[PDB]
Design a protein around this ligand. Structure first.
Ligand SMILES: O=C1N(Cc2ccc3ccccc3c2)[C@H](Cc2ccccc2)[C@H](O)[C@@H](O)[C@@H](Cc2ccccc2)N1Cc1ccc2ccccc2c1
Lengths: 99, 99
């Protein structure tokens, strides 16, 4: 679809058997999810945003379905205020920005 | 232009007679520029990101030219690490997300 940006561009995802909604985010290099149970191992990472740094767990090869589109990739889980889909997964579902 | 997202979607903006590059950010509701001196009167506001919150000054009715398309709106200025064009202006320049 085409998303105009008068609304937050939110979409439904499934990950880990759970249903979430997440923001489509061109400024975010990677995907960050609020606190979740993910099957696997993880690495600690910190990322920085507007107000500072947060510590997240990196999990790799996680399957997500963003609308009816599957992508596999890295997901960071942490204390974000909002679930964010970033450019690592956006490229996989073929998203573009047009003006 | 159609921007694919294998690299950061950065564009050249002209604001207050200065030239700057800024990230096109669909996740961000508003536009936040790094400290820059920009003429007029303003209010303080606090915005929250990942990591937490920064105090910004906000100026309304600022002219921006974003990739050589004009718009006028609110610009927040404050200690952001990257200049962000958010939805408030993305909407005026007609941007859409497509997948
Ligand atoms: O903090 C934000 N980040 C950090 C971010 C997020 C995920 C990441 C994943 C991997 C690596 C880095 C990441 C960084 C990005 C902007 C940004 C990018 C790079 C450096 C600094 C900032 C994001 O693109 C932007 O939409 C929002 C996401 C968000 C939305 C809502 C609530 C929390 C976080 N803001 C706050 C942001 C940005 C601008 C705003 C303007 C007005 C009002 C609120 C604003 C909030």
């Amino acid at each position: 679809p085409q998303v105009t940006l008068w609304q937050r561009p939110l979409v439904t995802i499934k990950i880990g058997g759970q249903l979430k909604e997440a923001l489509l985010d061109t400024g975010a290099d990677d995907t960050v999810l609020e606190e979740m149970s993910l099957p696997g191992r993880w690495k600690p990472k910190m990322i920085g945003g507007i107000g500072g740094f947060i510590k997240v767990r990196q999990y790799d090869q996680i399957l997500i379905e963003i609308c009816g589109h599957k992508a596999i990739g890295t997901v960071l889980v942490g204390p974000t205020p909002v679930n964010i889909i970033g450019r690592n997964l956006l490229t996989q579902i073929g998203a573009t920005l047009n003006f």
